[PDB]
Design a protein around this motif. Structure first.
Motif, PDB file in Angstrom:
ATOM      1  N   UNK A 221      -4.387  -5.581   1.445  1.00  0.00           N
ATOM      2  CA  UNK A 221      -3.129  -4.844   1.418  1.00  0.00           C
ATOM      3  C   UNK A 221      -2.608  -4.784  -0.014  1.00  0.00           C
ATOM      4  N   UNK A 222      -2.157  -3.604  -0.425  1.00  0.00           N
ATOM      5  CA  UNK A 222      -1.659  -3.393  -1.776  1.00  0.00           C
ATOM      6  C   UNK A 222      -0.179  -3.785  -1.853  1.00  0.00           C
TER       7      UNK A 222
ATOM      8  N   UNK B  20       1.969  -2.324  -4.740  1.00  0.00           N
ATOM      9  CA  UNK B  20       2.403  -0.975  -4.389  1.00  0.00           C
ATOM     10  C   UNK B  20       3.655  -0.995  -3.505  1.00  0.00           C
ATOM     11  N   UNK B  21       3.674  -1.874  -2.506  1.00  0.00           N
ATOM     12  CA  UNK B  21       4.812  -1.956  -1.585  1.00  0.00           C
ATOM     13  C   UNK B  21       6.066  -2.510  -2.262  1.00  0.00           C
TER      14      UNK B  21
ATOM     15  N   UNK C  50       6.234  -3.762   8.614  1.00  0.00           N
ATOM     16  CA  UNK C  50       5.357  -2.617   8.845  1.00  0.00           C
ATOM     17  C   UNK C  50       4.437  -2.829  10.050  1.00  0.00           C
TER      18      UNK C  50
ATOM     19  N   UNK D 157       7.599   0.215  -4.380  1.00  0.00           N
ATOM     20  CA  UNK D 157       8.347   1.133  -3.522  1.00  0.00           C
ATOM     21  C   UNK D 157       9.688   0.539  -3.082  1.00  0.00           C
TER      22      UNK D 157
END
Lengths: 162, 163
Positions: free
Chosen positions: B136-137, B140-141, B125, B144
């Motif tokens: 940074x989460x 969450x990544x 990213x 996904x």
């Protein structure tokens, strides 16, 4: 909007309510005439007020006028949220001492808004890529800021103290 | 560890088909000699086996030896996690074909660790600076990635299958 209600203590103790609302700067001759004091300006007390700080019944007119002077020397941005600022700073003396260590985040309504400001439009953590933006926990950063500093919420935005 | 029981369908001994266990690589001549097959190696079947995959009664010695070769050629961590791989791939043949599209995240225990690696070690990213990394989460990544990619959790790590 700054004003105090000064009563005659020589009449109030008996029962009769004789006082008046005075605005600043409070002039002694006006008070003497309005509430019927003597040559010494003797026996008055403050029985009501509308101020951005606490005051005692036995606070002198000289004390009040002095605090008014100090408040007037402040920048207008600080005067309009003085009551909130005097919650952290416990005195006008102290507020004026550190007046330049204050940052007014004008368009912030909470710590999330403050976190998003420092990250996006300040670059507080270096440049942020596009794809990464949806994974930055601003809520978490705003928290770490609030825990490690002082942020005062008000109608003119968030005031941060360094 | 790896062996198969091959019976001679036409030769009985004491009311029971003649058979024996054979370890890999299964030598044709050994089989012929042991269970008494004819010169054309005919009349045999697999009636038992101890293998890390499914195989049929009518699977040939050639096929078995080919499966053994294919498994032996895989990386060790794939070898020890065949049962998990074969819930995704339909066969050892297909696994072997697609083995170079499998990424072995050996150091990762869950998708957080996988997300962490792609963002920090890979730059999937873009450039993640020092101080920013702490906010940074990654859960969450990783979620996904798992929702849209193919990742298998195993005791030897997370395996990712990529196009």
């Amino acid at each position: 909007d700054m004003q105090v209600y000064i009563a005659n203590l020589g009449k109030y103790n008996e029962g009769e309510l004789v006082g008046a609302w005075f605005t600043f700067p409070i002039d002694f001759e006006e008070v003497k005439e309005k509430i019927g004091l003597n040559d010494e300006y003797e026996e008055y007390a403050i029985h009501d007020y509308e101020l951005p700080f606490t005051v005692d019944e036995y606070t002198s007119i000289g004390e009040l006028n002095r605090l008014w002077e100090m408040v007037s020397e402040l920048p207008e941005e600080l005067q309009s949220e003085l009551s909130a600022l005097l919650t952290h700073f416990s005195s006008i003396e102290e507020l004026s001492e550190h007046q330049e260590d204050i940052i007014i985040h004008s368009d912030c309504d909470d710590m999330y808004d403050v976190a998003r400001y420092y990250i996006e439009e300040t670059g507080a953590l270096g440049e942020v890529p596009a794809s990464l933006q949806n994974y930055i926990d601003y809520q978490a950063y705003g928290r770490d800021l609030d825990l490690s500093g002082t942020f005062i919420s008000t109608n003119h935005g968030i005031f941060e103290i360094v």
